Amino acid sequence: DVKATLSFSDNSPSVELPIYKGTMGPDVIDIRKLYGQTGKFTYDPGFMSTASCNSAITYIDGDKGELLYRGYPIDNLAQNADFLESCYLLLKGELPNAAQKKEFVATVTKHTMVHEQMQFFFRGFRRDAHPMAILVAAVGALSAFYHDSDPRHREVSAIRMIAKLPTLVAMAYKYSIGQPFVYPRNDLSYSANFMRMMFANPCEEYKVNDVLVRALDRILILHADHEQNASTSTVRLAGSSGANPFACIAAGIACLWGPGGANEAALNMLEQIGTPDNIPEFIKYDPRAKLMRETCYEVLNELGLHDDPLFKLAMQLEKLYPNVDFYSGIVQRALGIPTSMFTCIFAMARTVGWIAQWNEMIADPEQKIGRPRQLFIGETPRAAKPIDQR
């Protein structure tokens, strides 16, 4: 790649550092041979100025308001594809045709069921345990229940995680409220099946609402991947050591757990407010925002929640633009999803991204185990005393 840079010092000799250009975004400065020429490291807490890798999965530009999966703008993609199409895209690099989608959906459908032993495994959890705690433990236990899976095995594990994640998420919810597990349906779509596994009770037939299904499906698309981040880099970092894909994704969701989330934080704000707002206002571009706004509109109108306390959110909408997290929190609450499940939904959507990032890291010819450095500011060499002298 073109151009080069020079790193000069006061007394120490200088060094020449190669510069690589990408298809999109900032140029990168190669420092792979920095320490082996200067005897010095770079200092970058959080790696916010350090490119960990080269990727082809997702490009993001906050200033230009750009978010693209494999070259497709997020809003344009969502208007021409559902979630499983977006999964196929992130994994394969291209959007699927009619035949390719049919085969892919069929493969996912055939692996949605969770082994009965792993269902029994859930009964070991405390009944007062939080769903997210259950989910993290469940995903981290996938290796113990599915150890039969070389490039084909990486495909099997990928399909198994994508297919079983909604089932595991719904199982965590059902267990936390003391309701029996609901088995998936082959004739239902991805998001429709999840909605049923979540809310179908054995007392009545579950009526699938397409407006709610499309709403959930769009939320999943818009959170499928977010290039390099805390959880994604954790997946890549753990994978660089040669850990199995199940464990790496488990490491990712553990990181995604955090303290609540962005969706919950916005929703908790609205729940602390009535219709006024008047005293609260006195106390006081996103490509996905437009689509989620339309989604939030359709859901509230479909459910006839135009007269409910959620009107305060629609009023604050008109009266610092409302982000995707604002609408998502409203929609999920409208779908009957508890705030305790919000992070679970997040992990469910981000899982395909993690797998794609993991696959790319593995396939990378420069795949070496991650070994970050440090600046030692601790004790100088000292001598240990026999404990009776301390």
Added chain:
Amino acid sequence: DVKATLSFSDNSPSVELPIYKGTMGPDVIDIRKLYGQTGKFTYDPGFMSTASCNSAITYIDGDKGELLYRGYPIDNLAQNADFLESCYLLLKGELPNAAQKKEFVATVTKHTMVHEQMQFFFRGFRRDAHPMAILVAAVGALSAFYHDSDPRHREVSAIRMIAKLPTLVAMAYKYSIGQPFVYPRNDLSYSANFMRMMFANPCEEYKVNDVLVRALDRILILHADHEQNASTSTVRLAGSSGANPFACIAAGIACLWGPGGANEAALNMLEQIGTPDNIPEFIKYDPRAKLMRETCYEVLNELGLHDDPLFKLAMQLEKLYPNVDFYSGIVQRALGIPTSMFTCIFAMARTVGWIAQWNEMIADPEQKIGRPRQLFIGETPRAAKPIDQR
């Protein structure tokens, strides 16, 4: 800190980068304001030239053969302290006196037991499941069974993990071989208690061998921490997002899992060989090596294994110096520890290091969520087609 550096280019303007010196080791070059001045990132796959943080826990210099916990050389420390003293050191920053150790050991002892519900939880696992898979899932399930735990809570979680890790490890072993769990003993030391929970059968009283106990205890000390690495940085990375300590350690052990380990690789080599060696030789500094050599000597002599097939290892010792991984694999095999448990033992020792690294990351005033960058080499912006057109 003293000195500064200049980053020059061909056409683009130059930038001044501050340089910080540590108490030991290489200087670091501050690039926290690089992207906000040049519009460029650094390229460093594996972060092998990037200091992720400043630390006071462990310093390592391979060329000078240096490995120090809080300023104490690893060999000098091990000759004047046991494992729990080394744990106290890594966590508190100082070696404990008689009174401080007594209180610390008592605290660990009181938390060694695993809740019966979590014992029942193990019964959900398949009987053909590998111990490591069970352990990773178990550690990842700690949040679901211990959710009652601000600076005191971080101490409770630290003690709970250190105390219960040997119990969980031994439970995984016992479950994999179909033997009942063995409860800890308050009158036994850390390593003695682990050896008993591992090998005590309900058919006879377990005789504790001090030679074997000291051997295991030294192995734990020498693997307590290894500054920044794949698993440790994973713990720090996941922790930067605000994930609970249980989850971060679970994320760490998931990374430590890998493909087997170094100890197993060396042992598998010896098992493929007889006393000659003669045909194998024809086919063909570490501060910890000296201590482990003495340890390996004492163990083999104590167990009278001087005439066994392990003599091939002692013969290869005399006939590229034998590292710590060489002796450790021999000792653990002599202790009756299966190769399937080797990584479990590794995680058991490294856990205290992970906690120390996590504590330091949390206490750090520069604690921000990790956000590594990337070099995008993917698709340029394109337009999605309706699926019937694809």
Added chain:
Amino acid sequence: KYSIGQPFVYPRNDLSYSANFMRMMFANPCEEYKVNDVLVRALDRILILHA
């Protein structure tokens, strides 16, 4: 069902002997089980010939 990790399937009073067995064997909780009479008669004959 136990060997493949699928839940047990309860019998049906309106189904014949061999039809009921085929369902208890292959009916999954993800879709309604379609009973094929050709397959049922086939299984039923096998049972007769090995009674």
